[PDB]
Amino acid sequence: ANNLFVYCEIEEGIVADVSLELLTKGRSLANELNCQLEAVVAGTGLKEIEKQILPYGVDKLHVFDAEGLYPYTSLPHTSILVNLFKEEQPQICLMGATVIGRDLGPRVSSALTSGLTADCTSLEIGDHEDKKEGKVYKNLLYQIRPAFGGNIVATIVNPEHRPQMATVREGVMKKEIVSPAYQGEVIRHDVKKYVADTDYVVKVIERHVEKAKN
């Protein structure tokens, strides 16, 4: 119903290590939430892409294969996530604290009017009791990292905004498959229906090189 998504970053046809680390962590979290683990991958020429991803315990892999999706540019990838997340209503989204993450994260979260904790150092599942309105939020994503000038390790929660989004650096989480034969549904979408066109033209105007008139 409301699942956990991981954005899988693609470099030269290969899914990044940090992404696999987050598939692994996503699996653990998904186990605890009793929900599904879904992945998104966007690039060009992704026929046997499931094979780097499904073994990690991915229930549903969303594939956006089109010639202008690689290399990464902000608008295409952003609109894909924003649109997909509008339909799927993920409760959680994780991605690598990479150069792409540092770009894609802020845009997608802003567009979905959601939270984002960057460079999380641990991810747990936990509750939060709001004494003020007297309610208990259950099964929130605990976004854990050093805080306040590195004085303590604090936890951040987004009680209401979805998705709860977080990034993690490479090497923080271990990667580990479930089974090389893990079975998962692969969905190859029509990029047209998800991606947003370019609409920019680079010109060099002639009059910019004509001597200024008196």
Q: List the interface residues with a copy of itself, window 70-99 (CB under 8 A).
A: 70-76, 78-79, 82
Vertex 2 angle, CA 47 and 34, to 5°? 95
Nearer to Na ion, 89 or 179 (CB): 89
52 is a site residue for a copy of itself (CB under 8 A): no
List Cβ neighbours of 70 (8 Å cut-off, separation of 6 or more). Answer: 10, 42, 43, 44
List Cβ neighbours of 81 (8 Å cut-off, separation of 6 or more). Answer: 7, 40, 93, 104, 108
Collapsed DSSP state (helix, strand, coil) of residue 137: strand
Collapsed DSSP state (helix, strand, coil) of residue 22: helix
User: Among a copy of itself, Na ion, none, what does residue 107 contact (CB within 5–8 Å per kind)?
Assistant: a copy of itself
List Cβ neighbours of 37 (8 Å cut-off, separation of 6 or more). Answer: 3, 4, 6, 23, 26, 27, 30, 56, 57, 58, 59, 60
125 is a site residue for a copy of itself (CB under 8 A): no
Q: With contacts defined by CB under 5 A, name the span among 51-59, 78-86, 159-167, 185-193 that binds Na ion.
A: 159-167
Binding a copy of itself (rule: CB under 8 A), the pick from 34, 48, 131, 181 is 131
Q: Which residue has the tokens 């009793």?
A: 34
Which tokens in the block code for residue 117? Answer: 């904790």
List the interface residues with Na ion, window 58-117 (CB under 5 A). Answer: 112-113
List the interface residues with a copy of itself, window 185-204 (CB under 8 A). Answer: 188-192, 195-204
CB of 146 vs a copy of itself, minimal distance in Å? 5
List the interface residues with a copy of itself, window 6-25 (CB under 8 A). Answer: 12
CB of 85 vs Na ion, minimal distance in Å? 9
Rounded Cα gap, residues 106 and 39, in angstroms: 19
CB of 212 vs Na ion, minimal distance in Å? 31
Binding a copy of itself (rule: CB under 8 A), the pick from 32, 86, 89, 154 is 154
Q: What is the contact surface with Na ion in residues (CB under 5 A)?
A: 112-113, 162
